[PDB]
Design a protein around this ligand. Structure first.
Ligand SMILES: *NCCOP(=O)(O)OC[C@H]1O[C@H](O[C@@H]2[C@@H](OC[C@H]3O[C@H](O[C@H]4[C@H](O)[C@@H](N)[C@@H](O[C@@H]5[C@@H](O)[C@H](O)[C@@H](O)[C@@H](OC(=O)CCCCCCCCCCCCCCC)[C@H]5OP(=O)(O)OC[C@@H](COCCCCCCCCCCCCCCCCCC)OC(=O)CCC/C=C\C/C=C\C/C=C\C/C=C\CCCCC)O[C@@H]4CO)[C@@H](OP(=O)(O)OCCN)[C@@H](O)[C@@H]3O)O[C@H](COP(=O)(O)OCCN)[C@@H](O)[C@@H]2O)[C@@H](O)[C@@H](O)[C@@H]1O
Ligand SMILES: CCCCCCCC/C=C\CCCCCCCC(=O)O[C@H](COC(=O)CCCCCCCCCCCCCCC)COP(=O)(O)OCC(O)COP(=O)(O)OC[C@@H](COC(=O)CCCCCCCCCCCCCCC)OC(=O)CCCCCCC/C=C\CCCCCCCC
Ligand SMILES: C[C@@H]1CC[C@@]2(OC1)O[C@H]1[C@@H](O)[C@H]3[C@@H]4CC[C@H]5C[C@@H](O[C@@H]6O[C@H](CO)[C@H](O[C@@H]7O[C@H](CO)[C@@H](O)[C@H](O[C@@H]8OC[C@@H](O)[C@H](O)[C@H]8O)[C@H]7O[C@@H]7O[C@H](CO)[C@H](O)[C@H](O[C@@H]8O[C@H](CO)[C@@H](O)[C@H](O)[C@H]8O)[C@H]7O)[C@H](O)[C@H]6O)[C@H](O)C[C@]5(C)[C@H]4CC[C@]3(C)[C@H]1[C@@H]2C
Ligand SMILES: CCCCCCCC/C=C\CCCCCCCC(=O)O[C@H](COC(=O)CCCCCCCCCCCCCCC)COP(=O)(O)OCCN
Ligand SMILES: CCCCCCCC/C=C\CCCCCCCC(=O)O[C@H](COC(=O)CCCCCCCCCCCCCCC)COP(=O)(O)OCCN
Ligand SMILES: CCCCCCCC/C=C\CCCCCCCC(=O)O[C@H](COC(=O)CCCCCCCCCCCCCCC)COP(=O)(O)OCCN
Ligand SMILES: CCCCCCCC/C=C\CCCCCCCC(=O)O[C@H](COC(=O)CCCCCCCCCCCCCCC)COP(=O)(O)OCCN
Ligand SMILES: CC(C)CCC[C@@H](C)[C@H]1CC[C@H]2[C@@H]3CC=C4C[C@@H](OC(=O)CCC(=O)O)CC[C@]4(C)[C@H]3CC[C@]12C
Ligand SMILES: CC(C)CCC[C@@H](C)[C@H]1CC[C@H]2[C@@H]3CC=C4C[C@@H](OC(=O)CCC(=O)O)CC[C@]4(C)[C@H]3CC[C@]12C
Ligand SMILES: CC(C)CCC[C@@H](C)[C@H]1CC[C@H]2[C@@H]3CC=C4C[C@@H](OC(=O)CCC(=O)O)CC[C@]4(C)[C@H]3CC[C@]12C
Ligand SMILES: [Mg+2]
Lengths: 140, 27, 18, 208, 579, 420
């Protein structure tokens, strides 16, 4: 199940039910392109990076020995955290490491100068076309 | 101490305005 | 300002011609 | 026993009678921020997700409609005494008696791992489980490094871990016990050494 | 206007000469106080804090050094079992990576054809923080019976660091094998980029996003001076903040640290100080123009991590510093790096260093290249306006020169198997001999009307200006060195005039001749002369190393040169000999 | 013709060789070559999203029109063949359009020569069939072998398809065909909003070809203009309504046109909108985006005033202005109006500042990848370097286009009044 993110409105969500083979390592890789944001949309520390939320791993890990049905009112509190459905399987919810990714950043000190320069570039075309369309050729 | 964001009026506005007006319009 | 410098000249020329 | 992601993690299960799940989600996030002195007001549509097959209810559930589930996590949220004090003030003994006296802020954060959790869920009132009873489980998991805390001492103690020893149980509690794992995985049925003789020894299949 | 065009016509030669002299003089004025600036911190995260060093494990480092040396002698390679046991003992989270590669040709200098090795690294997981950031302390270990003291000091530093709580970033203690080959394999596997075709086992443990690294090379019990190397692969440099961090601990610990092996005091007496500044600046320029990774730090800079190499030298100077002092300096550097709350973005990334505590930013040395490029621009304008005062004649020289450049790039690595069968030469020597033979065959033009030659020379000048400017932006030293030699001869070349003199000036400033002159200048600056025979031997070794590094590490000097700068010079050769 | 076939073969061979090279991946990811509305990876992503049951317009990666997804659903295979065929078809359309335009302009020149409307001695300015023989071939050669077009088709960008649509609009307009010109202009407006500005040049050329004086008092002009406008609007409305039914939703209109008009991506490009809106105060964001999108449509009317009797040059200038001031410009868009340069190369004698501007454009183009690499991968440069390169590139483009316009005006004035 995958839902796509919308800019400034939704995060990406990607859920998979993978069957891990015995004595193996399974690699789940997905490609991403970093996005350039507005100069006011960055954190106060914009060169530190942006944190990707840790991934959640839910599984029914097999057990060495079978567990008898437990009574939540007569058992230690650490044994009643998760409901147990099968004797030979127990439920674990692992969380992976947070990921620190850096986005490309604007200058943060160039809002006036960029406005001036881009406006000047536009005005170059404006003035040249205005001259060419308005004025007419004359001798001497 | 620190520096607030202030426009470089003399450095850039004058330059990028005198690159347009005397280059195209006035003369 | 680069937009308005030639426009004002045109308006002044029109006013002089009228 | 229990694992949580870095920073704040808030996943909640709304009742089927609710209508505006997102509005109640925002209101509850702000209220929890006020209660626990954490910046949970940053939980927005950009952070919130609705898992389709994960984070099933941890208590009694008639049906599992994920339309009523919201899960948000703030990986950069910090946890400190500013968050532990509201958490400690929600216990009946409130660090005055029982095992809560061991919760020293300096020692708890001198750790490789530290997690503060608040879990609310409905459980069976009796063995027949025909009725609903509400359970609140406030947990605090820490891991003491062998090189930082021990510094080569190679001997562990309650005093050496929490800068404080247990003195009295919480008078409100109907059960206050300390479990120390003494299993030797390699030795033939031997056990770890504990200086004071335990009241009893309990064996069961925990985590497989 | 027409008057401006006529004025350009009349004064092209004086303007070009004045511009070239101005560029040379501007480069030679880079070492003077108006243009050179004293280095400053510019990073408050590291300048507003202080550290109290408590490194006392100077005997543990020596014992580890003796143990590692004995085990390396016994094993005949990097002792993996001992390293993994000792890292576990000191408390690191030890891992192992096994890599392998086949070199294009035998490497005579390092004595390797197919390289197989293992990288041992242990990660100090930072308490009170998730594994999101990382600092690397690496020891480049090669089959040279060296760096045992560096390994011992690395292990002692790891033992000291492990018991502390004030780490916001994981620390990776990496012991590579086969010098920079192991570092490149480890970096490629860590970042999951297959950039050079290295084979390696998948990595099982990572410490998050690497932020800074320090490579330690030490082969003596006591040092007399620390040395810092900043220039990296492809002329890339770390942020100046890392260099300022290293240099600010020399005053703190009373250490004697040198740049390029030269100790330049702060006296800056006008009689002698600028000469030492120029010596250091020229050494840095040549080293940056070579484009090779001089230490293990050079391969780190490609992945946007600021890296430094801190060599230790024992060189008869009476005041011998201690391993404890070196460890204290390293501990302070790593603690101040840990004080960083974000990636190094302050200070500067493009600079030249006429001394350990002096620097020149990009806005202050760029005029040196720009003045030289102005000569090419003026000559191109003059040729354009003289033309305004032939596709068939141009396409043949253009295609022939580009094809010969492509052959110079592609042919030498291949054909060694073919050439060795017929000729009594080695596989490694066949590559260099093929390089030289193709270089000469380019001179021997097979194929070989004023407008044709002015058009061809104008195209060549525009192409040369493009390449010189683009190289100068990425690697100023390479661009400056290429411009200084090719601009005057490219401008001067023309069929009408002294053809023998023009041919001599063109040949003597070809990229091969520029490389030979650079080698001679380098050896002269290191106070170690060269006869013609040993200079030729060093030139051949440099050619072999430059060809090898393009495959091994991805150095751009060989492909860039042999594909863009050789055909462009052949265009000027064809201009000189026009039909 | 044989030379046209030879040029087509050379271009196809070069494109195929670059397709099979190792530089295809490098080219495919260039910000100068691909754009948020034209990347091939985004086409593949939007096609893969439909297989998951997710609408491709619910995300922020896919911004292409339903017609593109329908075309590439059937033709997801042979994509490189599709793009090579589109480039060849653009070359063919431009070749034949220019070949017919040369005949039309020679007939006009012969008419005003017979009427002696020109100056007594303008023999040098007189166009001759010998000089116009290889202009159609050079038009197709400046497009097929342009490095911009080669990169834009090797990267598999739909910019090539939009260029083919514009070229077929030009061809149909030059060969009468008001219906086909309206359909192709509607298709071009479908892919990118800006090509709607070419409506005035197309209408002017059609009126001139049909010999209707363009006068306010004239009624035939109004009748023909109304027919052409209704035909264009109907062809656009039918396309919009039909392509609604592909996903049975209107979500494509935001993801395409609101994306084009509001510039939400802010991803580096050769354009001038990426930084202006990254480094921008939010007080004036709406005002300045309105001004910048007005800029593209600003010059069509005053250009029509001056160039009423020269509609093809007006169309060329309009294409150039679109390619320069588009919200998400591309080197492929820039390469479409550089295919017209051989047409106007008879204006060379009146062209000032040609060498410097060509050198500046070449320098900026070669410097885009180098400074992009320094900023992004090397880390030793800022976004300021890339912004400066975009500024210089666009200034060079603007000055080159105004320079050709000035040369055209000079030639007209000399023809009318007398060359000395
Ligand atoms: N207790 C107590 C406390 O203390 P106290 O006491 O208080 O005290 C202390 C303090 O201190 C401090 O202070 C401060 C600080 O600050 C810090 C900061 O940081 C950051 O920032 C930074 C940044 O980052 C960086 N980046 C930088 O940047 C810069 C900026 O900013 C500035 O502004 C400037 O500089 C910029 O620039 C500019 O601006 C420029 C502009 C101007 C001018 C313009 C020009 C004009 C025009 C031109 C010409 C004309 C034309 C005509 C001609 C004819 C920047 O810089 P950069 O960036 O570096 O860069 C620059 C640039 C770039 O580059 C460019 C280049 C380009 C390339 C090339 C070009 C093209 C070429 C072409 C080719 C040729 C052609 C050929 C042809 C021929 C043929 C034959 C014929 O940029 C730009 O923009 C540029 C512009 C562009 C323009 C244009 C274009 C181009 C060109 C055109 C021309 C020409 C061409 C054509 C033609 C020719 C030929 C033809 C013939 C006819 O900045 C800063 C630094 O400073 C920030 O932060 P962050 O961290 O980042 O973040 C945060 C938030 N989140 C800020 O904010 C801050 O503030 O500190 C400082 C220092 O630092 P350092 O580190 O040390 O340093 C660094 C450096 N790097 C100081 O200073 C201050 O004051 C305070 O604040 C506090 O902190 C403390 O406390
Ligand atoms: C039954 C209705 C059908 C509706 C559907 C039709 C759609 C038509 C749309 C566009 C037509 C495109 C052709 C443009 C060619 C312009 C060339 C031209 O100027 O040639 C002129 C002839 O003038 C014209 O035919 C142009 C009139 C077009 C106005 C239509 C507006 C509504 C259209 C809605 C768009 C729907 C399409 C949807 C899909 C996209 C003659 O130039 P010459 O060189 O041959 O000189 C010979 C002689 O000397 C003058 O003789 P004439 O009597 O024929 O001239 C009268 C007048 C002409 O002035 C103009 O050129 C203004 C029109 C410009 C075209 C606009 C296109 C739309 O000259 C005068 O005397 C008056 C003096 C002052 C007038 C202008 C001064 C200020 C300018 C504008 C007003 C200021 C306000 C700002 C501008 C905004 C506009 C409100
Ligand atoms: C001829 C052909 C054609 C093309 C070409 O050649 C061929 O033409 C060439 C030519 O045309 C060149 C240009 C010429 C003009 C140049 C101008 C130049 O800017 C000036 O550069 C000077 C260099 O000495 C000073 O800048 C210092 O540069 C040092 C690095 O080299 C910094 O180290 C220092 O700042 C440090 O800041 C932190 C402090 O702790 C330190 O003590 C201080 O050293 C800077 O100086 C600082 O510069 C700042 C502006 O950026 C402020 O001015 C600041 O002032 C402080 O202001 C505070 C209040 O705000 C006050 O409290 C405090 O006391 C002051 O100190 C000032 O210290 C000066 O400053 C700054 O302007 C710019 O870099 C490059 C430049 C464009 C050139 C780029 C390349 C070119 C185009 C060449 C090009 C190839
Ligand atoms: C003939 C055909 C083509 C000829 C040339 C083609 C190749 C040219 C390509 C690149 C050459 C341009 C060199 C880049 C200039 C870099 C300078 C720069 O960025 O400086 C930065 C600051 O720069 C600025 O402030 C504004 C820079 C404006 C640059 C304008 C001039 C650049 C190019 C002009 C012409 C180049 C040569 C032309 C000759 C033919 C950093 O400054 P600092 O020193 O770090 O800080 C100290 C205090 N602020
Ligand atoms: C050619 C274009 C101009 C650039 C010229 C810059 C070259 C500067 C040369 C030397 C100064 C920097 C070198 C210092 C690095 C180490 C010192 C040294 O002498 O290395 C030397 C290395 O020399 C170089 O790497 C120079 C750069 C290689 C260029 C080869 C490119 C091939 C293309 C040829 C086509 C024409 C000799 O290597 P070694 O003998 O193996 O070293 C001894 C090892 N035990
Ligand atoms: C494969 C490397 C080719 C280098 C240049 C050979 C082509 C010669 C023709 C014209 C030379 C003018 C450009 C020279 C400027 C220097 C180019 C440069 O250093 O930037 C390179 C990339 O820049 C470019 O894309 C230049 C391509 C423009 C010409 C087509 C760096 O590539 P890398 O280091 O291999 O990527 C690894 C990332 N860590
Ligand atoms: C591949 C990735 C980056 C590559 C960058 C290259 C892209 C450049 C593409 C287009 C830039 C061109 C912009 C201006 C085009 C001018 C159009 C034009 O045809 O003007 C023509 C004028 O041409 C010029 O003046 C420009 C030539 C002067 C400088 C260019 C030549 C030197 C540049 C070569 C550098 C690279 C060389 C490498 C091997 C070729 C008119 O000629 P004509 O009218 O047919 O003459 C007969 C009179 N009856
Ligand atoms: C790259 C262009 C500008 C120049 C061409 C290469 C030069 C850098 C080379 C070519 C021949 C070389 C010379 C060949 C022979 C000698 C003799 C030898 O010097 C001595 O005899 C030392 C003094 C003594 O005689 O005892 C070594 C340096 C020198 C001058 C060499 C210096 C470097 C030279 C000039
Ligand atoms: C084929 C052509 C002729 C179609 C012409 C229609 C466009 C001009 C319209 C159709 C949909 C419109 C967009 C619909 C939604 C938005 C989002 C809107 O931003 C918001 O979310 C603000 C909402 C609010 O203001 O309440 C800004 C305008 C924009 C881009 C609109 C801009 C104008 C668009 C592209
Ligand atoms: C469609 C053609 C035939 C008419 C000419 C188009 C442009 C001259 C102008 C007219 C109205 C303008 C739009 C009016 C409203 C908006 C909403 C505005 O929404 C936002 O505030 C988000 C973007 C931002 O603020 O940066 C974005 C610009 C946009 C699409 C404008 C873009 C430029 C437009 C299309
Ligand atoms: Mg900062």
């Amino acid at each position: 199940h995958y839902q796509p993110a919308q800019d400034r409105l939704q995060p990406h969500l990607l859920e998979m039910l993978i069957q891990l083979p015995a004595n193996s390592v399974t690699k789940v890789s997905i490609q991403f392109e970093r996005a350039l944001l507005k100069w006011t949309e960055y954190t106060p520390d914009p060169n530190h990076g942006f944190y990707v939320s840790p991934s959640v791993l839910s599984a029914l890990v097999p057990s060495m020995v079978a567990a008898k049905p437990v009574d939540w009112e007569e058992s230690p509190l650490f044994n009643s955290l998760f409901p147990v459905s099968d004797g030979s399987n127990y439920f674990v919810r692992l969380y992976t490491e947070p990921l620190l990714v850096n986005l490309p950043t604007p200058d943060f000190s160039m809002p006036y100068n960029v406005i001036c320069l881009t406006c000047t570039v536009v005005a170059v075309c404006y003035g040249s076309f205005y001259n060419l369309l308005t004025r007419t050729f004359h001798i001497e | 101490g620190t520096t607030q964001l202030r426009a470089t009026a003399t450095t850039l506005i004058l330059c990028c305005l005198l690159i347009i007006l005397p280059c195209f319009i006035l003369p | 300002l680069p937009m308005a410098v030639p426009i004002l000249l045109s308006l002044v020329k029109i006013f002089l011609e009228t | 026993f229990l694992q949580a992601p870095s920073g704040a993690e808030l996943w909640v299960w709304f009742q089927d009678t609710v209508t505006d799940v997102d509005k109640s989600w925002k209101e509850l996030s702000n209220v929890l921020s006020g209660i626990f002195c954490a910046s949970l007001n940053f939980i927005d549509s950009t952070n919130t997700v609705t898992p389709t097959a994960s984070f099933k209810p941890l208590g009694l559930a008639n049906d599992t409609d994920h339309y009523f589930l919201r899960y948000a996590v703030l990986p950069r949220e910090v946890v400190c005494t500013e968050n532990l004090t509201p958490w400690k003030k929600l216990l009946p003994c409130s660090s005055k008696a029982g095992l809560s006296v061991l919760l020293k802020a300096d020692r708890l954060f001198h750790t490789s791992y530290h997690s503060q959790a608040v879990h609310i869920r409905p459980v069976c009132r009796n063995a027949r489980c025909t009725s609903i009873s509400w359970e609140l489980r406030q947990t605090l998991s820490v891991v003491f490094d062998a090189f930082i805390t021990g510094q080569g001492k190679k001997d562990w103690s309650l005093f050496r871990m929490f800068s404080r020893t247990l003195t009295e149980p919480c008078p409100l509690a109907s059960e206050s016990r300390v479990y120390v794992d003494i299993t030797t995985y390699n030795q033939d049925n031997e056990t770890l050494e504990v200086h004071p003789p335990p009241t009893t020894t309990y064996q069961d299949v925990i985590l497989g | 206007r027409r008057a401006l065009a006529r004025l350009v016509l009349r004064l092209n030669a004086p303007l070009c000469v004045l511009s070239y002299v101005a560029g040379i003089a501007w480069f030679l004025a880079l070492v003077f106080p108006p243009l050179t600036q004293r280095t400053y911190m510019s990073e408050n995260a590291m300048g507003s804090t202080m550290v109290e060093e408590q490194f006392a494990g100077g005997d543990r480092a020596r014992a580890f050094a003796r143990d590692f040396a004995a085990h390396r002698k016994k094993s005949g390679a990097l002792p993996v079992a001992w390293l993994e046991r000792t890292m576990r003992s000191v408390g690191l989270e030890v891992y192992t990576q096994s890599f392998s590669r086949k070199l294009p040709f035998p490497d005579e200098t390092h004595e390797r054809y197919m390289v197989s090795g293992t990288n041992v690294y242990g990660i100090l997981r930072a308490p009170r923080a998730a594994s999101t950031e990382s600092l690397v302390l690496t020891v480049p270990c090669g089959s040279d019976s060296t760096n045992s003291q560096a390994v011992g000091l690395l292990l002692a530093l790891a033992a000291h660091f492990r018991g502390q709580i004030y780490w916001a970033k994981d620390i990776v203690f990496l012991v590579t094998e086969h010098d920079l080959l192991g570092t490149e394999a480890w970096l490629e596997a860590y970042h999951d980029v297959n950039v050079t075709g290295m084979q390696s086992s998948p990595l099982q443990g990572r410490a998050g996003a690497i932020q800074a690294a320090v490579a330690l090379e030490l082969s003596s019990d006591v040092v007399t001076s620390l040395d810092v190397a900043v220039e990296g692969l492809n002329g890339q440099l770390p942020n100046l903040d890392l260099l300022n961090l290293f240099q600010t601990f020399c005053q703190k610990g009373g250490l004697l640290c040198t740049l390029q092996g030269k100790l330049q005091p702060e006296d800056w007496t006008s009689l002698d100080g600028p000469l030492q500044g120029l010596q250091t600046l020229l050494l840095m320029v040549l080293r940056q123009a070579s484009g090779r990774p001089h230490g293990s730090h050079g391969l780190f800079l490609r992945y946007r991590v600021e890296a430094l190499t801190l060599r230790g030298i024992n060189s008869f100077r009476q005041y011998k510093y201690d391993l404890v002092a070196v460890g204290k300096a390293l501990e302070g550097m790593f603690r101040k790096l840990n004080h960083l709350l974000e990636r190094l973005h302050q200070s500067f990334f493009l600079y030249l260093l006429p001394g350990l505590s002096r620097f020149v930013s990009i806005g202050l040395y760029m005029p040196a290249v720009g003045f030289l490029l102005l000569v090419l621009g003026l000559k191109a304008l003059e040729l354009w306006m003289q033309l305004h005062e032939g596709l068939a004649s141009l396409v043949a020289p253009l295609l022939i020169s580009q094809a010969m450049g492509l052959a110079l790039y592609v042919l030498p690595v291949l054909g060694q198997h073919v050439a060795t069968q017929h000729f009594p030469v080695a596989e490694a020597e066949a590559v260099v001999l093929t390089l030289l033979a193709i270089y000469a065959a380019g001179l021997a033009l097979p194929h070989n009307p004023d407008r044709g030659w002015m058009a061809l020379k104008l195209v060549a000048l525009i192409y040369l200006a493009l390449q010189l400017g683009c190289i100068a932006l990425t690697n100023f030293s390479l661009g400056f060195l290429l411009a200084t030699t090719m601009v005057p001869t490219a401008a001067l070349a023309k069929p009408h005039g002294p053809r023998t003199l023009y041919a001599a000036l063109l040949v003597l400033t070809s990229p091969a001749a520029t490389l030979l002159g650079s080698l001679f200048l380098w050896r002269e600056l290191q106070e170690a002369p060269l006869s013609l025979a040993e200079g030729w031997q060093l030139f051949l070794a440099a050619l072999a190393q430059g060809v090898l590094e393009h495959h091994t590490y991805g150095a751009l000097l060989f492909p860039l040169l042999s594909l863009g700068l050789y055909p462009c010079w052949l265009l000027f050769w064809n201009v000189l000999f026009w039909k | 013709a044989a030379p046209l076939v030879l040029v087509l073969v050379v271009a196809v061979t070069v494109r195929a060789a670059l397709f099979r090279s190792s530089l295809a991946e490098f080219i495919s990811e260039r910000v100068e070559v691909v754009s948020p509305l034209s990347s091939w990876k985004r086409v593949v992503e939007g096609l893969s999203l439909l297989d998951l049951g997710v609408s491709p317009y619910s995300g922020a990666v896919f911004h292409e029109t339903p017609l593109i997804i329908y075309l590439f659903h059937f033709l997801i295979d042979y994509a490189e063949l599709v793009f090579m065929i589109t480039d060849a078809l653009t070359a063919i359309a431009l070749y034949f359009a220019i070949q017919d335009f040369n005949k039309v302009v020679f007939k006009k020149q012969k008419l005003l020569l017979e009427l002696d409307q020109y100056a007594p001695d303008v023999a040098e300015l007189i166009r001759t069939p010998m000089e116009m023989r290889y202009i159609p071939l050079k038009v197709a050669l400046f497009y097929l072998l342009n490095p911009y077009t080669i990169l834009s088709c090797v990267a598999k960008s739909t910019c090539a398809i939009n260029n083919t649509l514009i070229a077929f609009f030009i061809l149909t307009t030059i060969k009468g065909s008001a219906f086909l010109s309206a359909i192709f202009l509607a298709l071009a407006t479908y892919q990118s909003l800006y090509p709607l500005t070419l409506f005035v040049p197309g209408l002017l050329y059609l009126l001139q070809r049909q010999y209707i004086p363009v006068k306010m008092k004239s009624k035939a002009f109004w009748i023909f203009s109304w027919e052409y406008a209704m035909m264009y609007v109907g062809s656009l409305v039918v396309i919009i309504c039909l392509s609604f039914f592909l996903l049975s939703s209107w979500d494509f209109i935001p993801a395409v046109y609101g994306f084009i008009l509001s510039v939400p991506d802010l991803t580096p490009n050769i354009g001038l909108f990426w930084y202006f809106f990254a480094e921008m105060f939010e007080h004036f964001s709406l005002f300045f985006v309105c001004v910048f999108q007005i800029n593209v449509f600003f010059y069509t009317i005053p250009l029509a005033i001056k160039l009423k009797e020269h509609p093809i040059f007006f169309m060329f200038i309009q294409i150039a202005v679109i390619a320069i001031f588009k919200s998400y410009p591309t080197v492929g868009d820039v390469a479409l109006y550089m295919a017209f340069f051989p047409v106007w190369n008879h204006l060379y004698r009146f062209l000032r500042n040609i060498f410097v501007l060509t050198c500046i454009i070449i320098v900026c183009s070669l410097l885009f990848p180098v400074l992009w690499h320094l900023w992004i991968y090397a880390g030793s440069a800022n976004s300021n370097f890339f912004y400066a390169i975009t500024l210089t590139f666009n200034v060079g483009q603007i000055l080159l286009i105004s320079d050709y316009f000035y040369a055209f005006l000079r030639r007209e004035y000399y023809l009318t009044h007398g060359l000395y």
